[PDB]
Design an enzyme around this catalytic site. Structure first.
Site, PDB file in Angstrom:
ATOM      1  N   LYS A 197      48.131  12.917  30.453  1.00  0.00           N
ATOM      2  CA  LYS A 197      47.153  13.857  29.958  1.00  0.00           C
ATOM      3  C   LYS A 197      46.384  14.411  31.131  1.00  0.00           C
ATOM      4  CE  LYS A 197      47.573  10.377  26.795  1.00  0.00           C
ATOM      5  NZ  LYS A 197      48.592  11.064  26.008  1.00  0.00           N
ATOM      6  N   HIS A 222      41.423   4.720  22.752  1.00  0.00           N
ATOM      7  CA  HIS A 222      42.665   5.377  23.050  1.00  0.00           C
ATOM      8  C   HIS A 222      42.615   5.597  24.559  1.00  0.00           C
ATOM      9  CE1 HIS A 222      45.674   8.652  23.224  1.00  0.00           C
ATOM     10  NE2 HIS A 222      46.210   8.036  22.186  1.00  0.00           N
ATOM     11  N   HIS A 225      53.864  11.274  28.697  1.00  0.00           N
ATOM     12  CA  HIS A 225      52.573  10.726  28.204  1.00  0.00           C
ATOM     13  C   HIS A 225      51.310  11.092  28.987  1.00  0.00           C
ATOM     14  CE1 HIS A 225      50.040   7.264  26.514  1.00  0.00           C
ATOM     15  NE2 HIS A 225      50.450   7.931  25.452  1.00  0.00           N
ATOM     16  N   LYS A 257      42.706   4.010  28.283  1.00  0.00           N
ATOM     17  CA  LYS A 257      43.354   2.840  28.866  1.00  0.00           C
ATOM     18  C   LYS A 257      42.713   2.598  30.227  1.00  0.00           C
ATOM     19  CE  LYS A 257      46.493   5.705  26.773  1.00  0.00           C
ATOM     20  NZ  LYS A 257      46.288   5.172  25.419  1.00  0.00           N
TER      21      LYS A 257
END
EC number: 3.1.4.-
Length: 425
Positions: A104, A318, A102, A320
């Site tokens: 990025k 989107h 997950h 966090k």
């Protein structure tokens, strides 16, 4: 600006709201340096799209896609990439069930140095179109001079920490990136790296990853002084039959560490319905009815998405973020931007009577600590030394009629922004 924290550009809001925001095309621009090679760590990829975000002159430079796809999904990714001879893939091992890769992150090697980008967006058009996403941009790290003896390390130990993070993949293609990092001077780095990597960590290894890593940094580099904890995310895992099982027990405990009200921000159905995207925004807010129905207790902690400060109340989150504001929300003890949503998978869960921390996924974030800037706290920048908090404070609680956005149930009583209904299936 000491933070180098940015939001992505959002189409369809007034220009003033995009003035200090970045698009992926800006990030990959020639103005940022003369690209030689790059690595793109992410979850979802649209390769044709990704390639066009690079400037024409750089489109043929080597690119490494680091992903977690398996079986057919893997085959599909390889298929997307086949036409682009300069693209290679690295499948991150996911040896624990239900984990995802997950993280990025971009690693950008230039003629002039190296840039690391840690952010929240998938590499697809929609993630960079009308969503609120976050970006941390490293400085241009210079290469270490061919005859010196230096670690190139920062006081936050970012260089060694990033290498350890890459090392855990145990992938030949990343060894090349590790070697590149070794060659550069990352000493100007003023943030702390917070990563998650799949595994079962015991002993001191528990402090290396997930929420224990955060806990460990808050104990060592922050100090104590009813300062709430704010958690803001776009997905929610199964946290247990009640909150003492994980949320308040280990998760909150780690987050309240320094040297207590917990507020969680997650879009309501109404927030999604009236967004710039309408209901399809909900396609990027996974929260299954399956999981939700087992934990209705959680929803009393939920607060609406509101971002008047950055003109993004209608741009669904989107990004966090996690942070520790003072009782009146005028200042913060720290701030974290990361890819980690609200789940045990992402943050880790204690096993074997608290001796072992189990993490299923790869996640990565950067922690901003006032001590790293020589401060004791950051003042909150009211209208996006003062930290740019991208949503409004104080958080606003869900109304009695509100419900958390749940993505796999229909919403057919009220049309959204585009006059459509949502009927999953």
């Amino acid at each position: 600006n000491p933070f180098q924290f940015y939001l992505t550009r959002v189409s369809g809001v007034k220009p003033k709201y995009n003035s200090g925001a970045l698009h992926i095309k800006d990030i990959l621009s020639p103005l940022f340096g003369t690209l030689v090679s790059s690595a793109q760590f992410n979850y979802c990829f649209d390769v044709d799209w990704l390639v066009k975000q690079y400037p024409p002159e750089f489109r043929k430079k080597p690119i490494l896609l680091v992903h977690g796809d398996k079986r057919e999904a893997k085959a599909h990714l390889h298929a997307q990439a086949k036409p682009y001879e300069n693209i290679s893939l690295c499948q991150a091992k996911l040896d624990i069930a239900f984990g995802t890769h997950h993280t990025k992150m971009m690693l950008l090697l230039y003629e002039e140095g190296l840039r690391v980008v840690i952010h929240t967006s998938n590499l697809i058009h929609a993630d960079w179109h009308q969503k609120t996403q976050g970006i941390w941009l490293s400085p241009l790290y210079p290469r270490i001079a061919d005859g010196t003896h230096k670690s190139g390390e920062s006081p936050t130990h970012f260089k060694a920490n990033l290498i350890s993070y890459l090392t855990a993949y145990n992938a030949p293609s990343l060894k090349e990136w590790i070697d590149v990092i070794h060659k550069h001077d990352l000493s100007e780095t003023n943030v702390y790296l917070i990563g998650s990597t799949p595994g079962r960590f015991q002993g001191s290894q528990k402090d290396n990853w997930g929420h224990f890593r955060l806990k460990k940094l808050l104990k060592d580099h922050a100090s104590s002084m009813s300062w709430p904890v704010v958690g803001q995310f776009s997905s929610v895992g199964s946290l247990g039959a009640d909150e003492s099982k994980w949320l308040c027990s280990e998760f909150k405990e780690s987050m309240l560490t320094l040297g207590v009200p917990l507020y969680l921000i997650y879009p309501s159905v109404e927030n999604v319905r009236t967004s710039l995207e309408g209901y399809p925004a909900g396609g990027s807010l996974p929260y299954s009815i399956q999981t939700a129905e087992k934990q209705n207790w959680l929803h009393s902690y939920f607060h609406k998405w509101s971002a008047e400060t950055s003109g993004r109340s209608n741009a669904m989150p989107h990004i966090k973020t996690y942070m520790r504001p003072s009782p009146d929300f005028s200042k913060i003890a720290w701030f974290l931007v990361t890819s980690a949503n609200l789940s045990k998978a992402a943050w880790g869960a204690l096993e074997k009577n608290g001796t072992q921390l189990m993490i299923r996924s790869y996640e990565l974030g950067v922690l901003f600590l006032p001590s790293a800037l020589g401060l004791d706290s950051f003042k909150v920048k009211q209208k996006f030394a003062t930290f740019p908090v991208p949503y409004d404070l104080p958080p606003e609680l869900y109304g009695s009629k509100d419900r958390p956005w749940i993505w796999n149930i229909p919403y057919v009583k009220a049309p959204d922004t585009h006059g459509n209904m949502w009927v999953p299936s």
